[model samples]
Target: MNVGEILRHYAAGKRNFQHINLQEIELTNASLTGADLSYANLHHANLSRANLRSADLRNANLSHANLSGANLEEANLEAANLRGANLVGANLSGADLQEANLTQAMLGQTYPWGTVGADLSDANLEQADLAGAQLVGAVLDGANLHGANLNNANLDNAMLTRANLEQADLSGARTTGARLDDADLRGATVDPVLWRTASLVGARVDVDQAVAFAAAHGLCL
Candidate 1:
């Protein structure tokens, strides 16, 4: 459907557009709260400045979409394809992004995946590649990240308080100024750079890995 048809339905409170083909439509500055857009085709769409708080976008193909200044608080984006999306100035607080492909996403303050009270807590992220993904200030509390690849990820100032990161690979990740208070890193594979600068306050780690991590960081274990 065209932009006018979509907005006309949006204004009439018919927000359930799940499985629809709305590819290449620019919906900037639209308020589409709690929309059921799961499994929809939104490839190459311009969603800049759109408010999609609590929207259901599970398994949606949003690859290469421009989502700058979008608010996705409490939205369901499980297994969504957000690869190469521009998420500058978007807010994704309380969103469920389990196994979502956020690779190559742009991040700044007020961007999508902003992570205020994010429920990634207890979510599975095994082997999900977030390499080079901008996670500055993203909340990842108590998330299950077994073997999740975060290699070379820009985690500056990211919050991982109480995150469960057993066997997670963080090799070559640029974690300068990251917060890891109360995170569990038992058996987590850490590169030399992250081991030296990672704050392990109130965290749990494996005996062998902890020993190595502390030794590398010059800290008393």
Candidate 2:
């Protein structure tokens, strides 16, 4: 259905829009709170600044979509396709993003000096693909990133305190000055040099990783 039709129905108290083809639709600043958009085709759609809090977006095709500044707190985005999407400054706290595809996505707002990343605190991103994504300065404290793919992702100064990153792939990922205190990193595939600058106080790592880190610093294990 088109934007008008869906909005009209939504205005009429209809929230179920599952499996709809709304690709490239313009819904900026729209209020879609608690709407069910599962399996919907929203590729390249403009949802910037939209209120989608607690909305169900499981398996939705949102590749290349503009979700900048959107409110997705507690939203269900499990297995959603967000490849190359713009999520700058979006609030995704407590969102369920398990198995979601976010390859090459822009999750940070660019400024003259640097980028301000999206808020994903406490979000569940187990097995999610975030390779090549831009997440500079993002807040991911207490987030569950178990088995997530973060290869080549930029995480400069990101906050990951108490986060669960077990078995996650961090090869080629940048974590300069990032905070990972108390985070679980056991079995995570990481480059010792790449994460050397990040704070890992109280962080958990495998014995192999510990040895590699020590060796990288010219220390004997």
Candidate 3:
């Protein structure tokens, strides 16, 4: 079934629509919570303000979809295509976005900044490509960004405390004014003149630990 049929089916109370083809359909404000849509084709669909909590969206194609103000808590978006999608003011806490394509997506901003940042924490983004994306003031706490490509990405005022970015590709990424008070950058990469240090004067991290990481990565003060 396509997006229209899926919506109708949802309104009528049903389940088990695995791999429904809804590519390029407009579904603004459509609620399909706890529905099985694994491997569904929802490419370029408009799902702004929709409630998709606890829904199974594994490997779904949501590229260019509008999910502004949508509630996606506890939803599984693993390996999903969210390229160029509008996600302003959406709450995606505890959502699984493992290996999802968020390249050039319109991720919403954070506190003290608007539309230029986003919080993608605890969302499994292992090896995801986010090159040249604007992530100013975004929070990536405990996010699985291992081997993710963040080349030329902006991270101003973003908090990455305790995040795992093991061997992540940050060749030309910019973290200007970003806060990494207690983040683990054991194997992360960065350019010599690539990072902008944020305020960590009274953080819990010790002086030696902070300085050591800074020196290793070549981040500026």
Candidate 4:
């Protein structure tokens, strides 16, 4: 269905829009909270600033969609395809993004002097594929990234306090100035030297990584 028709139906309490094809639809600032959009094809849609809190977007094709400043708190986006999507300044706190494809997605909002990234605090990104994603300055505190693929992802200055990175593939990922205090990195495929500059106070890691981390800091043990 078209944008207007879908919006009209949603307004009339029709929340089930599974498998709907709304490619490139402009629904900026639209409120579709708690709507079921599973398997919907919203590729290249302009959903900037849309309120999609608690929405069911499982397996949805949102590739290259403009989701900047969108509120997707607690949304279920399991297996969703968000490759190259613009999620700058989006709030995805507590959202379920298990196995989601976010490769090359822009999750950071660039300003004149600095950058602000998406808020994904306490979100579930277990096994999610975020390879090559730009997450500079993102707030991912307490997020679950177990087994997630973050290879070559830019996480510069990101806040990952108390986050879980167990078994996550972080090879070649940049964590410069990132705060990883109390985060778990056991069994994660990461270069300890790369995280030497990043804060690791109270962070968990394997014995080998611990030794490497200390060596990187000029310590012998």
Candidate 5:
């Protein structure tokens, strides 16, 4: 169905839009709160500033979509494909992103001077694939990233206070200047190169592993 038809149907209480191909569709500033779009292909769709709070987007194909400034608080995006998507300034606080594919996605502002960042505080990203994703300065405080793949992701200066990173793969990820105080890094696969310069004060790490890591990398930590 087209964007208009979906919007009209949604207004009329028709929540299910599963399997609909809305490729590159523009639905900016649309209020789709609580709508069900599971398995929908919305590749490259412009959903910037849209209100999708609590929406069911499981297994949705939103690759390269523009979700900047969107409100997706508490949304269910389990197993969704968001590769190369722009999520800058998007509010995903408390959202469920379990096993979601966010490879190469821009979750925060790309430019150095840009102040806006994605709000992902307390979000569930367990086993999510965030490899090569740009999350610079994103608010990930208290977020659950257990077993998540963050290989080569940019998390510079991001707030990860009290976040769960148990068994997470953070190989080659840039975390320089990132505040990970009180964050759980137990059994995490951190690249020695990045860990040497990471600010992990008060973080819950495996002391013996860190000792081995520091010794292996010749770091005086």
Candidate 6:
């Protein structure tokens, strides 16, 4: 269905629009709160500033979509294809993004911490390219980031307690003031720069380079 039809149906209390093909459509600032758009094809769509709170967008093709400043709190986006999508300043608190393809996608700049939480807890992000994505003051507790490329990621002041970072690439990532208490960093490619101001009260870094860096910086274990 087209954008107009979808809007009309949404206005008429019909929110399920699963598997619809709306590639390259412009739906900026539209209110699709709590709608179910799972498996929908929204490739290259412009949905900036749209309200998608609690929406079910599982396995949706949002590649190259513009979702900047959108509200996706508690949304289900498991296995979604968000490659090259622009999600700058978007809110993704408590969202389910297990195995989602976020390669080259822009997550956010200034994350919401005090009012709303950005819970990426228990999410699977294996081999994802989160390079240079701004995630300041975000929450990523217990998230699985195995083999994820986080090169140059701006994670300053973010909460990453107990998160799994096995074999992940954190080279050049900014971790100043970031909380990584008890986080798993075994075999993670941690650049020496992150240890300068990162809070690693009880974080574990099994790699020799990371261990040496932490030790040199007066960080015990």
Best by lDDT: 4
- In model 6, which runs have C-alpha deviations exceeding 4 angstroms? 110-127, 136-147, 207-210, 214-221
Candidate 1 lDDT over 60-90, as tens digits, reads: 9998898877887778888898887877657
- Model 3 Cα lDDT, one tens digit per residue, 1-221: 56667778888998777777776667777778998888987777778788888899888888778887788888988888877777766767668877878777666455443544444667677778777666666666667777788887777667766676666777776666766655555566655443335444333433454565477575566
Sort order, lDDT high to low: 4, 2, 5, 6, 1, 3
How many residue pairs clash in each candidate at the backbone level? 5, 0, 1, 0, 0, 0
List runs of model 2 lying over 4 Å from the truth: none
Give each model's whole-structure lDDT: 0.75, 0.92, 0.70, 0.92, 0.90, 0.78
**Whole-model lDDT for model 4 versus the true structure?**
0.92
Residue 86 lDDT, candidate 2, scale 0-100: 95
Superposed by TM-score, candidate 3 places the C-alpha of residue 11 at a distance from the truth, in angstroms, of 2.4
Q: Give the residue spans of candidate 3 off by over 4 A.
A: 1-4, 109-117, 198-221
Q: What's the true lDDT of residue 69 in model 1?
A: 72
- TM-scores vs. true structure, each candidate: 0.83, 0.96, 0.80, 0.96, 0.93, 0.75
Q: Pairing residues by index, what is the TM-score of model 4? A: 0.96
Which parts of model 5 are misplaced by more than 4 Å? 110-112, 212-221
What TM-score quantifies how close candidate 6 is to the native fold?
0.75
Mind giving the per-residue lDDT tens digits that candidate 5 earns over 116-205?
A: 679999999999999999998899989999999999999887888889999999988998778888889999988776566666787888
Superposing all C-alpha atoms, what RMSD in Å does each candidate have to the true structure? 4.1, 1.3, 4.1, 1.4, 1.9, 4.2
In order of TM-score, best first, we have 2, 4, 5, 1, 3, 6
Tens-digit per-residue lDDT, 1-221, candidate 2: 88889899998999889998999999999999999999999999999999999999999999999999999999999999999999989999999999999999988655888877899999999999999999888899899999999999898878889999999999999988789999999999988765578899999988888888888788874
Clashing pairs in 1: 89-110, 89-111, 90-110, 90-111, 90-112
After superposition, candidate 1 runs with Cα above 4 Å error: 109-127, 137-147, 218-221
Worst 10 residues of 1 by lDDT: 113-122
Decide which is better by lDDT, 2 or 6.
2
- The ten-residue window of minimal lDDT in model 2 covers 108-117
